[PDB]
């Protein structure tokens, strides 16, 4: 059974969440300011990352399937210059995706709040 705060049903079901994350991911990698970070990413990793997006953003309490977010981006930040601007771009691509799909405002806002919760997990909480 799905958790109480699972957004899958309201998004139209798992297939619909999977399609929305596809559109979103396509936006990310088509972004000239993000594409360079994704050039090295092979297909197995891409698929794991999409599953992480699906479950982290829409899966609800206890549903997250994937690597720790801190560890996943630590090298990107230390060695390749990943920064808060890239996060802003990625958050905005999800917003655009949901808006373009016509997602109701309340549902869209819950999803965007969940995306925002990833920021301190990736960049730490502050010095
Ligand atoms: C809610 C936000 C995010 C989530 C849930 C997330 C999730 C993940 C996960 C779980 C991985 C590891 C995949 C694996 O190998 O199993 C990953 C890797 C990666 N992420 Fe994210 N991420 C987020 C934000 C971002 C942002 C803002 C960027 C912008 C650059 C980004 C770029 C990447 C890249 C380029 C990789 C592959 C790194 C490598 O080659 O190992 N992610 N992400």
CA atoms of 107 and 92, how far apart (whole Å): 16
Three-state SS string over 45-63 comes to: HHHHHHHHHHHHHHCCCCC
Residues in CB range of 83: below 8 A, 6 or more apart: 77
CATH number at residue 123: 1.10.490.10
CA atoms of 114 and 13, how far apart (whole Å): 18
Number of domains the chain is built from: 1
The answer to whether 58 and 6 are in contact (CB under 8 A) is: yes
CA atoms of 31 and 48, how far apart (whole Å): 20
Q: Which residue range(s) make up the domain with 31?
A: 1-127
49 is known to lie in a ligand binding site: yes
The answer to whether 87 and 77 are in contact (CB under 8 A) is: no
The answer to whether 77 and 83 are in contact (CB under 8 A) is: yes
In the reported structure, the alpha carbon of residue 52 is separated from the centroid of ligand 1 by a whole-number distance in angstroms of 8
Determine the residue of 52, 63, 119 to mutate for testing ligand 1's pocket, defined as the one with the most ligand atoms within 8 A of the Cβ atom: 52
Determine the residue of 55, 56, 72 to mutate for testing ligand 1's pocket, defined as the one with the most ligand atoms within 8 A of the Cβ atom: 72
């Amino acid at each position: 059974t799905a958790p109480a705060d699972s957004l899958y049903s309201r998004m139209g079901g798992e297939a619909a969440v999977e399609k929305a994350v596809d559109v979103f991911y396509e936006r990310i990698v088509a972004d000239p300011q993000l594409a360079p970070f994704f050039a090295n990413v092979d297909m197995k990793k891409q698929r794991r990352k999409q599953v992480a997006f699906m479950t982290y953003v829409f899966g609800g309490s206890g549903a997250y399937e994937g690597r720790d977010l801190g560890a996943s981006h630590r090298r990107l930040i230390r060695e390749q210059g990943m920064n808060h601007h890239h996060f802003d771009l990625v958050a905005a691509h999800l917003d655009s995706t949901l808006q373009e799909l016509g997602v109701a405002q309340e549902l869209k806002a819950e999803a965007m709040a969940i995306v925002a919760s990833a920021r301190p997990l990736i960049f730490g909480t502050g010095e």
